[PDB]
């Protein structure tokens, strides 16, 4: 009965994870040989770094430009920075650039997307200069089309490296993110590890480990078949040979009518994968970013991401025709991403309606064991020993991503997006109260009752000691990322 549904759930969740782990290891071994067969003094691809932002933490927008200026790479052509919106509020976002690079803060009168002549000469006859554009804002799509146009008219630019405004690239980031574009002729985009430096909050650490487990495992498994479904948001390198062609249907999109712009990165990757080309991901391209801390902000972020996924996983499924035999993985990944959420929902509904202590303690223990195995592998790969905080990521998932998935599904057609989340919390609480008041008895002579009570008590103790370990670590300042431990010092003096 419950065995078909507990054991099959455990196998369904763990076998795919083991497959993804082994595929990521294969991809890392593949990339190490490429890196090894490379001359030390290698400059071949002339990149042009592109930044788009909007009121991004004056100090952090300084750290981003400083990191790009401190990045080691022989052949960097220029730096295109596009700042959304023109106002006395974005002038003090051009000034933080002007104090880092130069005084070429331009301001074209019209948005280069809405403007008829889409080509260059946007008050820009200078190709050997570091430029910053102040244009009216229409989203990251319109403010990145301007950058794409800027770093195209130079015939000596062959690739473009896209970054977000609140990112701090390591020194050997551009060098290791642009190499795979020169490794093979069918690669038109490379991903990059996007680490998280803000881990001073309980929601800001489990999500950090989720980013780790969604890049270095999830996005590493896909790169083995060279079909990465979504290039890294903050850090990513694109070949101009494909950007110059996909920039036109990228910012033209209509889904069902009304045109709206969210989840632009996955759209770029989707348009690259819909032309039969390949995308890989390299773990030697570390980049740092912050994370949302308030639960409501994280739920909003995840509902936007789920909105983006629910309209383009269809296209990722439908473009597997263009890819060859490698590309059945592209369908299996999407089918899994759907049926796993569906199976989790069904399991919760079943064990919440048909109340049974031995059919609830068993599920809790099996889920905890699977999460412990995943966290153990994450700890081994990262050599961090702080990766065992991933055990608590199940709570963050169940209480924030699932309401986000439901809300995105409902809007696919305060009360805008939080009513569904509040109703979901109320439903979970009602199920728990019904289960605890329905089985309100004590029978110590029953071995099954003893097993159920012992299991639930041991699980509660395990969760409590994990939380106590986290609290102690925060007290002694042990969870703080080595980057954050230095930004919190450079912040005091400024």
């Amino acid at each position, epitope marked *: 009965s419950a065995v078909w549904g507990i054991s099959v759930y455990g196998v369904f969740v763990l076998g795919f994870y083991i497959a993804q782990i082994v595929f990521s290891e294969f991809n890392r071994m593949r990339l190490s040989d490429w890196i090894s067969l490379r001359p030390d003094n290698w400059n071949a691809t002339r990149v042009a770094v592109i930044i788009a932002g909007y009121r991004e933490d004056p100090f952090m927008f300084k750290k981003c430009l400083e990191s790009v200026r401190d990045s080691e790479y022989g052949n960097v052509a220029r730096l295109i920075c596009v700042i959304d919106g023109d106002e006395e509020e974005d002038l003090k976002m051009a000034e933080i650039y002007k104090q880092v690079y130069n005084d070429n803060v331009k301001k074209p009168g019209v948005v280069l997307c809405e403007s008829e002549n889409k080509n260059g000469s946007t008050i820009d006859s200078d190709v050997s200069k570091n430029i910053c554009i102040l244009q009216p804002h229409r989203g990251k799509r319109e403010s990145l089309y301007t950058g794409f146009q800027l770093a195209s008219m130079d015939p000596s630019v062959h690739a473009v490296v896209l970054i977000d405004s609140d990112t701090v690239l390591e020194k050997n980031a551009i060098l290791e993110v642009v190499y795979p574009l020169s490794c093979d002729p069918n690669i038109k985009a490379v991903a990059g590890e996007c680490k998280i430096w803000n881990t001073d909050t309980i929601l800001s650490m489990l999500v950090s480990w989720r980013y780790f487990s969604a890049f270095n495992v999830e996005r590493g498994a896909q790169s083995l078949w060279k079909t990465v479904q979504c290039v890294g948001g903050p850090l990513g390198a694109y070949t101009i040979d494909i950007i110059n062609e996909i920039k036109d249907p990228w910012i033209t999109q209509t889904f069902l009518g009304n045109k709206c712009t969210y989840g632009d990165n996955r759209r770029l990757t989707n348009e690259v994968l819909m032309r039969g080309k390949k995308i890989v991901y390299t773990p030697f391209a570390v980049g740092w970013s912050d994370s949302p801390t308030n639960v409501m902000r994280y739920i909003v972020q995840q509902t936007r991401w789920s909105k983006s996924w629910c309209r383009e996983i269809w296209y990722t499924l439908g473009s597997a025709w263009k890819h060859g035999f490698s590309g059945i993985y592209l369908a299996f990944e999407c089918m899994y991403q759907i049926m796993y959420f569906f199976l989790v929902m069904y399991l919760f509904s079943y064990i919440a309606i048909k109340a049974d202590i031995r059919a609830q303690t068993a599920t809790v223990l099996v889920s905890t064991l699977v999460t412990i195995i995943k966290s153990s592998y994450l700890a081994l790969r990262a050599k961090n020993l702080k990766a065992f905080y991933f055990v608590l990521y199940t709570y963050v998932y169940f209480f924030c991503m699932i309401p986000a998935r439901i809300t995105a599904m409902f809007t696919m057609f305060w009360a805008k997006q939080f009513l569904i989340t509040y109703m979901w919390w109320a439903g979970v609480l009602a199920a728990g109260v019904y289960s605890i008041v329905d089985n309100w008895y*004590f029978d110590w002579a029953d071995i099954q009752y003893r097993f159920a009570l012992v299991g639930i008590c041991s699980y509660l103790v395990f969760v409590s000691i994990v939380l106590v370990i986290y609290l102690i670590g925060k007290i002694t300042t042990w969870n703080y990322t080595p980057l954050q431990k230095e930004l919190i010092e450079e912040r005091y003096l400024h």
Partner: nanobody, 124 residues
Framework: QVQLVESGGGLVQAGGSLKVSCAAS????????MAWFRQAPGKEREFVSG???????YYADSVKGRFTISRDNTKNTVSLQMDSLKPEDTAVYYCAARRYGGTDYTTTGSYDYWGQGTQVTVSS
């Protein structure tokens, strides 16, 4: 508060069944462990059978192949079946219930609610 009413008794030859049935009226019968006792003319109601809320079944000695126990949660009852009766079983049968208890399920001092009487006589 649960009221226990038991039925099923009469003369039967050695080798009959004569199933006994105890029904219980209460707020939630499915949480109550149930048990069947044998009030003999002596020996003060030796334990016979029992079954918890999770369907696990406990049986006394030398009755393993002769007594069968179960529950009906739809119509709250126990419905103890019997097989291969013996003249040594001529006794009253009692139905007992419990909600909160310890590890001593074989003594009458643990069960809280009690039945009335299920006298059964077996002929030669």
């Amino acid at each position: 508060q649960v009221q226990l009413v038991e039925s099923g008794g009469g003369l039967v030859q050695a080798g009959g069944s004569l199933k006994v049935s105890c029904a219980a009226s209460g707020r939630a019968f499915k949480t109550y462990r149930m048990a069947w006792f044998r009030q003999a003319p002596g020996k003060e109601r030796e334990f016979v059978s029992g079954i918890s809320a999770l369907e696990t079944t406990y049986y006394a000695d030398s009755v393993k192949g002769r007594f069968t126990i179960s529950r009906d949660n739809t119509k709250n009852t126990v419905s103890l079946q019997m097989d291969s009766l013996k003249p040594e079983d001529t006794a009253v049968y009692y139905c007992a219930a419990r909600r909160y208890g310890g590890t001593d399920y074989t003594t009458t001092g643990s069960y809280d609610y009690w039945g009335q009487g299920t006298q059964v006589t077996v002929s030669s």
